[PDB]
Amino acid sequence: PAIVGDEHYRVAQEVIRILQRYKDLQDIIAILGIDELSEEDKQLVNRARRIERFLSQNMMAAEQFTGQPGSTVPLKETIEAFDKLTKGEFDHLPEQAFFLIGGLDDLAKKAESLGAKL
Amino acid sequence: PAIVGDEHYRVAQEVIRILQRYKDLQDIIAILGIDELSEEDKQLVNRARRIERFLSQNMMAAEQFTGQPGSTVPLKETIEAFDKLTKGEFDHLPEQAFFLIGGLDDLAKKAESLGAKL
Amino acid sequence: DLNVEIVAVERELWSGPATFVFTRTTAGEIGILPRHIPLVAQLVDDAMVRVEREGEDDLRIAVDGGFLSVTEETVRILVENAQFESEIDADAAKEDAASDDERTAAWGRARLRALGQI
Amino acid sequence: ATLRELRGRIRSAGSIKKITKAQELIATSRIAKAQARVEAARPYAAEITNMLTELAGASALDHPLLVERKQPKRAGVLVVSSDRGLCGAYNANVLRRAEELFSLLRDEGKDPVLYVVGRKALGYFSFRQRTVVESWTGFSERPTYENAREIADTLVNAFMAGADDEGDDAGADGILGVDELHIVFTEFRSMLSQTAVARRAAPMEVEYVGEVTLYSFEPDPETLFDALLPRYIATRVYAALLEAAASES
Amino acid sequence: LVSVINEFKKGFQASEALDPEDLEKESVKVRKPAP
């Protein structure tokens, strides 16, 4: 918190906590399925899948491999977007909408292309 | 297919696919059994168990250990029997009816002995 | 005295001695006294039961799917559903009354009668 | 990297063990609850049985719900299964019993018209491509009397609509009904023993005995009998649902 | 190519028994004797 500030540190720690819990629950989901998780754990699993997809990004150097031009996200936008994600504000969007995009504008455009409204 | 023919090759590939799917499902089956599987998977698991039992045979050299004379199965009969088994024409017969026998006549005799009709 | 048993399908709701059991069967209003003759009757769709007990306030019960059985040793009212006067809420009863659905209208009217508004 | 994957598998197996043990204890508690609910439901069943028996004793036993159709060709069958699937052989045993009932009905020159309670049976019959007229789901774990009432209403309505049917024609109703109503569910005989059984809800063959102040019915014994028989059918369906829930737990 | 695929798609052709005694029946009890 001293260097990056309280907001950045808190958002990063929340993201790490959610991803750690999802990693813990992956085996249970694989064997018994998601339907046997508590409602809060189902919510966390959905949030974690969206977060892990959103951590991916189309890179400038990756175009040669995908044909998609790269993107850059400012730090403030990243912190705000992951704060929103950790609160479940994008839980209604499909997880595929979060895959290989930039900021929240890219998320909205891709969600619209996939039939959902951000 | 260029050597053993299209029918033999297709039947062998189907048998291998069913057995591989059963091997993949082994992990779930060990903990929860076949009951949590999908209907397709349950049908495939029963088919695979019968196929794996039918791949066994009473061997000529085994008579010394069991006293049961061995059996010879013509290749055409083998192909036909395993094609029928993969199709699902013997799913009603009990598993043990497929154990340590020769061709389809032996299967019919053993199934009749165990109660099932064929 | 006469023992009254208000019994629902899921559970036995109320049971105790009483002094006068008023209700409204299909034929008409009926009042059971301690030594009433054996009788079997069908309570009206929006029926209501009023139990006058010894040294206690009267008990008003809204009844749905009611049936009355007097045996000269205990009055037994078998109800698909029922609600005591205290538990009944006025506003919901008003809302569900005068509804096109006959069942909900009857239930609402029974609740109104049990409350006292008729 | 064999050791690394082995350690990962050990962690996964430990987590699965913890979850399964917790679910087992929760299932023990739920068995207690389901048995309590069955006991709570018992007295109303007893009283309604006695009342219906008296009404039959003091009325003509010619209700259309008590007479076997002529050259019957259809039979409604309600299969009660679970919603959640972590029960071991519950659904499999129930569906095996249902298939045996179908075989019996077909050998008796009838056609099964299928109704389903729970999702596992829905999936089974969807795979088999057997048509399901109606399905109710989402209450197998803890069924209420309203669900049983709805199921019994639908089944009895189909049975009544089957009275006027002639051959494959629906008759004056316009609805093609059925000639029988069977229930295939699991009995909770004891904590160790659960048995799947097939039970004919309708038509109800009359059981007679010699003997045991006559009752004074109003307005008429026949009217009360007609208004109570569906209630008895609903009560039996509710009891079957409660027993199925206990057996599933 | 899209039109040709649509036309081809238009033209393309795709690919024991219960014991009667075991069936316990619901019975209506009656005090009176049989007829």
Three-state DSSP class for residue C62 = strand
| Cβ-proximal residues to A99 (8 Å cutoff; 6+ apart), any chain | A53, A56
d(CA B107, CA B104) in angstroms, rounded, equals 5
Architecture of domain C2-115: Sandwich (2.60)
CB C8 within 8 A of CB C81: yes
Q: CA geometry: angle at B53 spanning B52 and B57, to 5°?
A: 110
Of the candidates D37, D47, D218, the beta carbon closest to that of C76 is on: D47
CB D115 within 8 A of CB D132: yes
Do D86 and A27 count as a contact with CB atoms less than 8 A apart? Answer: no
Number of domains in chain B: 1
Q: Which of A48, A29, A49, A50 is nearest to A38 (CA)?
A: A29
Do D41 and C27 count as a contact with CB atoms less than 8 A apart? Answer: no
Nearest residue on chain E to D236, judged by CA atoms? Answer: E26
Do D217 and C81 count as a contact with CB atoms less than 8 A apart? Answer: no
- Strands C74-79 and C67-70 turn out to be antiparallel
Q: Which of B4, B112, B111, B117 is nearest to B53 (CA)?
A: B111
Q: Do chain B and chain C touch with ≥3 beta carbon pairs under 8 Å?
A: no
Q: How many CA atoms lie within 13 A of A62 on its CB side?
A: 12
CB D90 within 8 A of CB D74: no
Sign of the CA dihedral running A46, A51, A52, A53: positive
Q: Which long-range contacts (CB under 8 A, 24 or more apart) does D175-179 make?
A: D176/D74, D177/D74, D178/D74, D178/D75, D178/D76, D178/D113, D179/D68, D179/D69, D179/D72, D179/D73, D179/D74, D179/D75, D179/D110
Three-state DSSP class for residue A80 = helix
List Cα–Cα distances, D165 to A77, B98, D69, in angstroms. Answer: 70, 48, 10
Nearest residue on chain A to D87, judged by CA atoms? Answer: A32
Q: What are phi and psi of D63, to 5 degrees?
A: -65, 145
Of the candidates D54, D61, D103, the beta carbon closest to that of E17 is on: D103
| Rg of chain D (C-alpha set) | 22
Three-state DSSP class for residue C70 = strand
Tell me the technique behind this structure.
cryo-EM
* Cβ–Cβ contact D14 with B under 8 A: no
Residues in chain E closer than 8 A to D198 (CB atoms): 18, 22-23
Nearest residue on chain D to A35, judged by CA atoms? Answer: D84
User: Alpha helices of D129-218 — where are they, by DSSP H?
Assistant: 145-161
CB A61 within 8 A of CB A103: no
- CATH homologous superfamily of D22-249: ATP synthase, F1 complex, gamma subunit (3.40.1380.10)
Token pair 């494959």 is found at: D168
Determine the angle formed by the axes of helices A39-55 and A6-32, rounding to 10 degrees.
120
Tokens of C24: 């409204």
Do A32 and D19 count as a contact with CB atoms less than 8 A apart? Answer: yes
Strand partners, E24: D199
The H or E element containing residue D244 is: helix D221-248
Q: What are phi and psi of B99, to 5 degrees?
A: -95, 125
Cβ neighbours of B37 (radius 10 Å)? 17
Do D19 and A28 count as a contact with CB atoms less than 8 A apart? Answer: yes
Residues in chain B closer than 8 A to A31 (CB atoms): 28, 31-32
Residues in chain B closer than 8 A to A32 (CB atoms): 32, 36
CA distance B37 to chain A (A): 10
d(CA C31, CA C27) in angstroms, rounded, equals 12
Residues in chain D closer than 8 A to C7 (CB atoms): 43-44, 47
Residues in chain B closer than 8 A to D128 (CB atoms): 39
User: Alpha helices of A33-86 — where are they, by DSSP H?
Assistant: 39-55, 63-66, 75-86
User: Alpha helices of C60-101 — where are they, by DSSP H?
Assistant: 90-96
Q: Do chain D and chain A touch with ≥3 beta carbon pairs under 8 Å?
A: yes
Cβ neighbours of A61 (radius 10 Å)? 7
Fill in the amino acid letter for D112: P
d(CA C97, CA C106) in angstroms, rounded, equals 7
| Cβ-proximal residues to A2 (8 Å cutoff; 6+ apart), any chain | none
Distance between start and end Cα atoms, chain D: 42
Fill in the amino acid letter for C74: T
Q: Which of D103, D112, D101, D77 is nearest to D240 (CA)?
A: D77
Q: What b/e string do you get for D53-87 counting C-beta neighbours within 10 Å, with b at 16 or more? A: bbbbbbbebebebbeebeebebbbbbbbbbbbbbb
DSSP letter, residue D198: E
Domain enclosing residue B68, as ranges: 1-118
The H or E element containing residue A23 is: helix A6-32
Do D228 and C11 count as a contact with CB atoms less than 8 A apart? Answer: no
| Cβ-proximal residues to A57 (8 Å cutoff; 6+ apart), any chain | A71, A73, A100, A101, A102
Residues in chain E closer than 8 A to D45 (CB atoms): none
* Cβ–Cβ contact D85 with B under 8 A: yes
Resolution in A: 2.5
